[PDB]
């Protein structure tokens, strides 16, 4: 079951790579030491084979949002307003281990060395939530197969190829945005602002005096950067499912109906990662309109009678460890 979600970013997208890189004033990512480099946390990035010339492909760098991030996103939005409202609406409450297995996939770090019975796997598998997301102490397999969000870009022409004849981004698609820190005590220069302090002017002068010793216990007032994809470009997402029930597909579609208010990226204090869905292809047919998904009726009905009757006994026997 192939779901091709084409979206368009409203604000820019910043999904940070764990590698700590550095940047000078005008470009020069990762300079040599001794240039007074600033810290930089780049947007995360897969390489991709691309035709940069006449039929020769290179591993050009592509900045994306990873599949684990938006798998956690899709799990969190479906468990935030499709499953847990249905859990608390009829009064059932998850256990603390059941909550840990619902959100993270495991209760503790240590799993069971034993295997579970097949009747358990038959209950939890082919289910609206535990079928899609496995885990627990027995490491149950999850039906749902969440890919990363590539941009529609010429470097990703080899990915989802022989499509989008026009509307293909070819230029540079990123920007480095600088964020500086202020020390608020330093930027006062008034009595009305320091009348609020316990201690007042002498306390502010003492903290500034400590900052004088620490200028030449990490202080404030830094000036850093982050490398961020530009906004307003098309992105594609793929969701896959092997032998899915109609309730599982309906739960994915209900999460994706109201996906538009959630955060695909990090750095959400700068509102980074707002996206508007251009369309949703359900095995190639366009099912997205302005008022959510039109089409896929049986999936919505099956998840409608599936989330009713969704107790927490199954979550509790999921999270129970031998």
């Amino acid at each position: 079951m192939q779901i091709e979600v084409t979206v368009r970013n409203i604000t820019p997208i910043f999904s940070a790579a764990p590698g700590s890189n550095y940047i000078t004033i005008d470009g020069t990512i990762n300079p040599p030491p001794g240039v007074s480099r600033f810290p930089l946390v780049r947007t995360r990035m897969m390489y991709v084979a691309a035709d940069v010339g006449d039929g020769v492909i290179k591993s050009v760098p592509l900045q994306i949002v990873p599949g684990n991030t938006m798998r956690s996103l899709l799990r969190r939005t479906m468990l935030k307003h499709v499953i847990e409202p249905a859990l608390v609406e009829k009064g059932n409450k998850l256990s603390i281990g059941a909550y840990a297995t619902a959100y993270s996939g495991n209760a503790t770090g240590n799993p069971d060395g034993v295997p579970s019975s097949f009747d358990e796997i038959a209950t939890m598998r082919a289910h609206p939530f535990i079928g899609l997301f496995g885990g627990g102490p027995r490491m149950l397999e999850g039906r749902l197969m969440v890919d990363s969000l590539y941009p529609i870009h010429t470097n990703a022409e080899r990915i989802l190829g022989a499509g989008y004849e026009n509307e293909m981004m070819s230029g540079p698609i990123t920007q480095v945005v600088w964020a500086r820190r202020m020390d608020p005590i330093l930027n006062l220069g008034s009595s009305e602002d320091v009348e609020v302090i316990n201690g007042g002017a002498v306390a502010a002068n003492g903290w500034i005096q400590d900052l004088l010793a620490n200028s030449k216990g990490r202080g404030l007032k830094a000036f850093n950067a982050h490398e961020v994809v530009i906004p307003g470009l098309k992105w594609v997402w793929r969701i896959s499912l092997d032998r899915p029930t109609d309730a599982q597909v309906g739960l994915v579609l209900l999460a994706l109906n109201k996906m538009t208010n959630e955060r695909i990226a990090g750095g959400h204090s700068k509102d980074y990662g707002r996206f508007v869905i251009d369309g949703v292809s359900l095995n190639g047919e366009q099912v997205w309109s302005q008022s959510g998904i039109t089409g896929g009726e049986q999936y919505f009905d099956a998840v409608a009678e599936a989330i009713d009757g969704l107790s927490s006994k199954e979550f509790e026997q999921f999270a129970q460890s031998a």
Binding site: G189, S191, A201, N205, Q209, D210, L212, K216
Partner: protein, 234 residues
């Protein structure tokens, strides 16, 4: 090498000479070594060194500035800054409601190169006068330009020798124009005065770096300006 520049924000502008006097007054009773170093005093007596003052007071629109030339001057400023800030804190919190003393600190490097084209640099509040022979030199123009020539070149040479880097010795200067002639006094209500030049302009074929101080009475806050801002003024 580099010069350390520290700005203090007292909320109201006080001049550099009264800042030096105010700082010498408040730290007179306690901690004599740091005020002796910041005043460039003798290790045994109260008399200042005849050499280049490594640290010096300067001008600031919301307060006063301090300049420490070289590693020794930068170290002196870095050790002496928090007790100075605590002193202005207690002084401005003793009377009135109380203000907060804000700080700034920069480390401006020194550099010089030579190009075969003269360059414009202006200096304000420049003191040229210490002796009666310099009155006799400034009375006639022809023997006055050469005195200003030698003074500017030897001032560049002495600060370059003090901070520890090599000056090219093929430099030629020229003095074009003057705007005003005014006196500076040594202490308040004193009859003795020193002649001084207001808005002098000079033309040097070399490139001039920031915190480049010329003339006499450098520790009192005269004859220094940043040449980096004057180079490509925006």
């Amino acid at each position: 090498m580099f010069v350390k520049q520290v700005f203090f924000d007292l909320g109201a502008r006080i001049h550099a000479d009264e800042a030096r006097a105010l700082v010498a007054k408040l730290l007179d009773d306690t901690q004599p070594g740091l005020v002796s170093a910041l005043m460039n005093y003798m290790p045994a007596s109260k008399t200042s060194k005849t050499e280049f003052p490594l640290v010096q007071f300067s001008n600031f629109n919301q307060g006063f500035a301090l300049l420490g030339f070289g590693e020794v001057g930068a170290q002196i400023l870095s050790d002496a800054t928090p007790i100075i800030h605590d002193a202005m804190a207690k002084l401005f919190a003793s009377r009135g409601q109380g203000v907060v003393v804000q700080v700034s600190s920069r480390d401006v490097p020194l550099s010089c190169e030579k190009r075969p084209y003269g360059l414009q640099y202006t200096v304000a509040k420049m003191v040229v006068q210490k002796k009666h022979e310099h009155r006799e030199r400034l009375a006639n123009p022809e023997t006055g330009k050469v005195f200003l020539e030698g003074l500017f070149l030897r001032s560049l040479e002495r600060q370059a020798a003090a901070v520890g880097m090599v000056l090219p010795r093929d430099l030629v200067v020229s003095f074009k124009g003057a705007e005003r002639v005014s006196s500076v006094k040594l202490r308040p209500d004193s009859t003795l005065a020193h002649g001084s030049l207001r808005h002098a302009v000079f033309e040097v074929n070399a490139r001039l770096g920031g915190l480049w101080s010329v003339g006499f009475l450098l520790s009192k806050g005269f004859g220094h300006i940043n040449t980096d801002l004057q180079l490509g003024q925006g």
